[PDB]
Amino acid sequence: AKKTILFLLTVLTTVLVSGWVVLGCGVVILKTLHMFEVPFLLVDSPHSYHSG
Amino acid sequence: QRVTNFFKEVVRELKKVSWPNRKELVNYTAVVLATVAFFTVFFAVIDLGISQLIRLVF
Amino acid sequence: FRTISNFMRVSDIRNKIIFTLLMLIVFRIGTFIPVPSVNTDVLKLQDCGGALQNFSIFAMGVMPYITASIIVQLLQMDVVPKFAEWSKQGEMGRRKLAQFTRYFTIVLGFIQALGMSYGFNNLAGGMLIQNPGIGTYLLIAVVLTAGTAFLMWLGEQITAKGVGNGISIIIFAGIVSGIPTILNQIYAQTLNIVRLLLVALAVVAVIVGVIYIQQAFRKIPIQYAKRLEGRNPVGGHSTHLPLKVNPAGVIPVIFAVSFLIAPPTIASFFGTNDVTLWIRRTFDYTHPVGMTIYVVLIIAFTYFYAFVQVNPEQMADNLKKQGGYIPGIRPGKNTQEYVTRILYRLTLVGSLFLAFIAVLPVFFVNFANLPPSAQIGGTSLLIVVGVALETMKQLESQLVKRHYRGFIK
Amino acid sequence: RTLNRYEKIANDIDAIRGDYENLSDDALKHKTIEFKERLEKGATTDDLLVEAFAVVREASRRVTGMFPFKVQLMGGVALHDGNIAEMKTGEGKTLTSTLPVYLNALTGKGVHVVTVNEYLASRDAEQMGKIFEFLGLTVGLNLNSMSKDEKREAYAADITYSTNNELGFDYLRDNMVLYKEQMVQRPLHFAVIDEVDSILIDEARTPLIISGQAAKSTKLYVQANAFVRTLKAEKDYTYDIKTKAVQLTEEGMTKAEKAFGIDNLFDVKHVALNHHINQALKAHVAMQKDVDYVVEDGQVVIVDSFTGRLMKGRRYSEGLHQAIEAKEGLEIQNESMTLATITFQNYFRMYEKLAGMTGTAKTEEEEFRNIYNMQVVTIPTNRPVVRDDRPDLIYRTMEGKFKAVAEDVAQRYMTGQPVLVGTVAVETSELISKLLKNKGIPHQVLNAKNHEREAQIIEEAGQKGAVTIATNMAGRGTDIKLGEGVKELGGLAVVGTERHESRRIDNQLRGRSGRQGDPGITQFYLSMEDELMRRFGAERTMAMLDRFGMDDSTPIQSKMVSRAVESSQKRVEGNNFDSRKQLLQYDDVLRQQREVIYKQRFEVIDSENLREIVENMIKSSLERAIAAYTPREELPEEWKLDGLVDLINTTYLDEGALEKSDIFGKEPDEMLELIMDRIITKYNEKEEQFGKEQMREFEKVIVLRAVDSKWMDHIDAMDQLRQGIHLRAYAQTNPLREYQMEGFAMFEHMIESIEDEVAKFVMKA
Ligand SMILES: Nc1ncnc2c1ncn2[C@@H]1O[C@H](COP(=O)(O)OP(=O)(O)O)[C@@H](O)[C@H]1O
Numbered sequence A: 001a002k003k004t005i006l007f008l009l010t011v012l013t014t015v016l017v018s019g020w021v022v023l024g025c026g027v028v029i030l031k032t033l034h035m036f037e038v039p040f041l042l043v044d045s046p047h048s049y050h051s052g
Numbered sequence B: 001q002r003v004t005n006f007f008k009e010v011v012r013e014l015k016k017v018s019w020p021n022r023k024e025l026v027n028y029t030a031v032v033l034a035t036v037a038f039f040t041v042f043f044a045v046i047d048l049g050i051s052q053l054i055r056l057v058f
Numbered sequence C: 001f002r003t004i005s006n007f008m009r010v011s012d013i014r015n016k017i018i019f020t021l022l023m024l025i026v027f028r029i030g031t032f033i034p035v036p037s038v039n040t041d042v043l044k045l046q047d048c049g050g051a052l053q054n055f056s057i058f059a060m061g062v063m064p065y066i067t068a069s070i071i072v073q074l075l076q077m078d079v080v081p082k083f084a085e086w087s088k089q090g091e092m093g094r095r096k097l098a099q100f101t102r103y104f105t106i107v108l109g110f111i112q113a114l115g116m117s118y119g120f121n122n123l124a125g126g127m128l129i130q131n132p133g134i135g136t137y138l139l140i141a142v143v144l145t146a147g148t149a150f151l152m153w154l155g156e157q158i159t160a161k162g163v164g165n166g167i168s169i170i171i172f173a174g175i176v177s178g179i180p181t182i183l184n185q186i187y188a189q190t191l192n193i194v195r196l197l198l199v200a201l202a203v204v205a206v207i208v209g210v211i212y213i214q215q216a217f218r219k220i221p222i223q224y225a226k227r228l229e230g231r232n233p234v235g236g237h238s239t240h241l242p243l244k245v246n247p248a249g250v251i252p253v254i255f256a257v258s259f260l261i262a263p264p265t266i267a268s269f270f271g272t273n274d275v276t277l278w279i280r281r282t283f284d285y286t287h288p289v290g291m292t293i294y295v296v297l298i299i300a301f302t303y304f305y306a307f308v309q310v311n312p313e314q315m316a317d318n319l320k321k322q323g324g325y326i327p328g329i330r331p332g333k334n335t336q337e338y339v340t341r342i343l344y345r346l347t348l349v350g351s352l353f354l355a356f357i358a359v360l361p362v363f364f365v366n367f368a369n370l371p372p373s374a375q376i377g378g379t380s381l382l383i384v385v386g387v388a389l390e391t392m393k394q395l396e397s398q399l400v401k402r403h404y405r406g407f408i409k
Numbered sequence D: 001r002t003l004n005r006y007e008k009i010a011n012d013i014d015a016i017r018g019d020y021e022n023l024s025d026d027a028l029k030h031k032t033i034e035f036k037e038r039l040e041k042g043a044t045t046d047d048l049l050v051e052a053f054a055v056v057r058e059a060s061r062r063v064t065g066m067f068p069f070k071v072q073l074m075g076g077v078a079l080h081d082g083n084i085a086e087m088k089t090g091e092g093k094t095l096t097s098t099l100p101v102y103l104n105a106l107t108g109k110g111v112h113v114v115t116v117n118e119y120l121a122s123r124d125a126e127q128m129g130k131i132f133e134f135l136g137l138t139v140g141l142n143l144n145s146m147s148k149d150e151k152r153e154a155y156a157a158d159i160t161y162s163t164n165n166e167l168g169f170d171y172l173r174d175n176m177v178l179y180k181e182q183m184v185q186r187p188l189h190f191a192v193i194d195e196v197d198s199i200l201i202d203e204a205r206t207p208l209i210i211s212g213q214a215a216k217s218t219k220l221y222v223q224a225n226a227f228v229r230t231l232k233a234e235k236d237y238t239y240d241i242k243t244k245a246v247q248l249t250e251e252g253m254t255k256a257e258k259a260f261g262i263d264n265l266f267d268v269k270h271v272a273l274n275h276h277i278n279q280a281l282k283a284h285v286a287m288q289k290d291v292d293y294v295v296e297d298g299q300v301v302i303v304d305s306f307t308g309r310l311m312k313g314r315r316y317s318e319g320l321h322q323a324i325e326a327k328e329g330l331e332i333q334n335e336s337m338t339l340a341t342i343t344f345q346n347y348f349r350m351y352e353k354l355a356g357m358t359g360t361a362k363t364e365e366e367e368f369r370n371i372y373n374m375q376v377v378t379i380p381t382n383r384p385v386v387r388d389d390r391p392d393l394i395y396r397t398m399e400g401k402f403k404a405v406a407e408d409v410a411q412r413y414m415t416g417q418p419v420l421v422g423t424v425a426v427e428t429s430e431l432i433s434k435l436l437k438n439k440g441i442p443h444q445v446l447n448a449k450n451h452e453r454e455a456q457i458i459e460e461a462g463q464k465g466a467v468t469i470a471t472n473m474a475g476r477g478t479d480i481k482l483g484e485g486v487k488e489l490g491g492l493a494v495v496g497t498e499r500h501e502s503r504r505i506d507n508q509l510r511g512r513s514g515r516q517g518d519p520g521i522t523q524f525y526l527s528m529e530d531e532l533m534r535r536f537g538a539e540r541t542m543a544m545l546d547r548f549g550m551d552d553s554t555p556i557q558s559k560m561v562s563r564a565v566e567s568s569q570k571r572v573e574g575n576n577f578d579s580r581k582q583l584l585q586y587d588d589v590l591r592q593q594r595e596v597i598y599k600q601r602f603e604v605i606d607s608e609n610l611r612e613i614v615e616n617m618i619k620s621s622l623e624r625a626i627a628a629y630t631p632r633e634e635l636p637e638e639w640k641l642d643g644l645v646d647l648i649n650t651t652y653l654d655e656g657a658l659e660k661s662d663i664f665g666k667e668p669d670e671m672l673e674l675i676m677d678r679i680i681t682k683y684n685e686k687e688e689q690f691g692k693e694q695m696r697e698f699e700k701v702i703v704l705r706a707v708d709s710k711w712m713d714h715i716d717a718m719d720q721l722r723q724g725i726h727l728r729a730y731a732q733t734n735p736l737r738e739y740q741m742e743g744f745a746m747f748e749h750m751i752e753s754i755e756d757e758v759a760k761f762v763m764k765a
């Protein structure tokens, strides 16, 4: 099933956002803060009066 | 050999893509560089003025 | 120019570009407004520190809203079935999902405000929040989530009454506001004139490459056999289904940096060791083993996200569901496998372009000795190019609304 | 607040009524004369408002015996301001369309009173025309069966009663005339709209299309009929019932390829055969015989979706009407071809002041405010509504519902109370009619096919012991007046039979029961295998409907199925909302283009000398032919001017007048002046030769024929673009911006084609 993969991706993303707890010394965390953009939002009978 | 067949298919597929022409490429690059230059100058002026005002109010 | 004067000459377009600049000024006064109860610290003295991120209201930016949107979009795909029915029901479900993103991003802005506050405290070594306690940390967490709430309301304001999409304009404003300090460091470095000219010509060359790949559509022809198509054809603007060369966007890099920097975060959550030091040396992407695993993760997540966003099976069932078909291809499963093959080849090219863009600035800092806070062309370059072009196209569509001529004149 | 202003004006009208009562007749027609004099002299229509409303009240009594109440005066003042008077159904919304119609009919510009169908238009026109023709104004009534001279004499009256379809079609046929004195309509001034929700909200989902007939095809309709008739309902096609959409399957596509001798049905060579198999499939299984058409004297007559009446001129488009005509062995007629097109939004938004009154508008205040900038004013009721309004009764099967509704009207017939059963189809009404023939109950039925006896059915439907079955016909304006001794026993039990596509439509049926303080009982009988529940009910509840059991003698008592019913109806409301909104913005694009062309076509109709129009067309086509050769990126003396001399001699200057030495590589302006001077001397020779007046009729015919043919082709090209548009949302853009940009490019190519055709037809003939 692909459900596990989707869940794993979500958990990893959450860990990345909330794993800002040790900042080294961060050489990636501030980059992560400024470098991403929003995703793009996901994707009868006609009549006709014949006269002229 | 499936991989070289696949890369031949990839180059054929790249032929079928409708790439922008030269005129649209130079117009778009002018728009991008002009917008970055204007907003860079605008935000520098904004930062200098607001920082000087904040320093004037202390 | 001519088209810029055309923008100024019309009153409606000039009204909304002036409204956009006013709300960007309103956003930019907030980067100096500090968080209360933090102010008595070394933040007035830190000039090992932050130095780029610094601090302020809107320290979150709109990044809680980005994370909320990408998480609920991955949950729509058969993970919470309630969201799948809300997506399949229509526009009332779209309002339900938008309100869910608003409450999800208030939740997420809260917990990331906790995380970032304690993390900047630990980066500062503790001595950045006087009286480190539960009440003050909850106060600054509600303050940062209020910052994100004001920025999202500001984005909705500037997308209702200003130029383009609001959240993209605010993200673009954060990037290009970061630019002039980098220009200041580049100048205060100077180490010749030929280094600046070669790196600036390479910057404009990679801007042209990003314009070239971002604005390229493979246009599948689609034939609707539900209308006559009788005796009024020209043949220019036939119906098609455009797929981009880079369908995934830039979200492959968020999944790649997550999967790259989560094991150093886990290993530092544990503490210093020998295998911890090997992990922290290995998973740094300024090094060739770390850069190889970064590039492989970018390619894998570009394939995963291009098949999430395009979804060949759902678009083939969506094409069978209302008439249309590709000419030659029987509209059930064969349409799905045709557009899947197109997607495999196109995503190979787009993923390689994304991987070359995302590791470009470490090559520029090494081979061109820039100050390492530059990052001249990461995914900030892709956000900058995308937002500039779609704001220009929205303004152009308002102009062509105002140009209806007539045969009499 | 705005309500207290209307109460203060209603009290002012009562105060003036104190003096207005003792005036004799022939001293009130002089009051209309005095109002026209005062309105010409210096006054507006607001001041006269107070006086004018009092006059109408007195006139109303003397003509009809009905005095307006105070809430009818509040409705008149709210309709005069351009608002929407929401007065409840039964509270006299026909005298409040007499007060501001009289006030805004005095200047002479003309008032159009729109209704939903022609029974209500004729019904209101007779009575209110008695009131208005008392006071010295004219009343015209514009119907579908009138010739253009009678329609021109109807719109030349001071007050016109028409339906919304006839107003739209007279507008679209006014912009297909060849003379200025063939147009029927006056310039549009003031529309009062009875039942605004039905006209501006409900049936503004659909456009008005006028189409002339192209050449006939008959072979492929009969071939696709004879194929689709033998096609095995579950194995070779799937009828999606949520949206009524029929597609073939892989066995069906294989049988279609092996029955026609083709190899691939989905080529680009067989788009015509695939279109015919699709439309024969839809006409066979997705359209049933008495539900949404009929057969009437060898013709297929479509039954209107909203009013339930026979639309005897309208025909299904994209080749579906010929597939229905071939389904039943009737004669197949010629294929149509769209000439003109408008929406009810963009037609009722060119009216300079637009009012309206209705009974059920408070749900749609945001839609009346966004699109039309009209605000719903809710007006009190003069007498409290004592209509007993019972909840639904959900059953498990359709036959259980119909046995229960027959038993209910049988127990209500026994006490003499009038019943009005209300269905939506022409076959469920005859199903319940044959359920009431046996059990022995004398009834009447008002189908789409029983339109001729409608007044004699509605006049008898409130008498002691009269049972009426009625479709959508008697559900929007029908005024059933109660008989003698019938108010005392709870008059006019209305019995519904299904839930409609909105709450307003069934609130209108209950409104037929109520009728201004007289008692009444409504009751809706529902099923779980209805059409609304089968199409739009959520997939979760069906397990619980299996759980509930099967005896169907008693209804379901639970809140689960009631939640399912209300959720399905709200989903239909949301779907209709979105379809209405996207039709609105796409016809906003086509509205800008249509306004440009209709304005300039009208100013080449009534132009006394259109020499300068034709000369600007020739000059614009000439400069485009100059710049289409001689490309300005290219350096001169390479410009291949020989093809330019050939094109100009073929198109403008009679094959001998231009040779290459006259131009010889100039800058384009001076050679453009040379070719333009040779064109203008050839044209002035033709003008002094042909005659000053015959030349204008000649080039008027040329200009109008070019505009009309290229605009028809542009309407059809914009419809094909509107199909492909959502597929353009796959590549992450929004498709409306693509539609606007492609529509602007396509419009300008059309207008360049018009100018080229007019230039070559005037200068080479
Ligand atoms: N001032 C009045 N006095 C007595 N009866 C009235 C008065 N105004 C209206 N009515 C009656 O109320 C009934 C309501 O019918 P109608 O006007 O069709 O309702 P609506 O205004 O809801 O369409 C009419 O039969 C009319 O005779």
Ligand code: BEF
Residues within 6 Å of the ligand: D089, D090, D091, D092, D093, D094, D194, D195, D477, D478, D479
């Ligand atoms: F406009 Be009514 F209720 F006949």
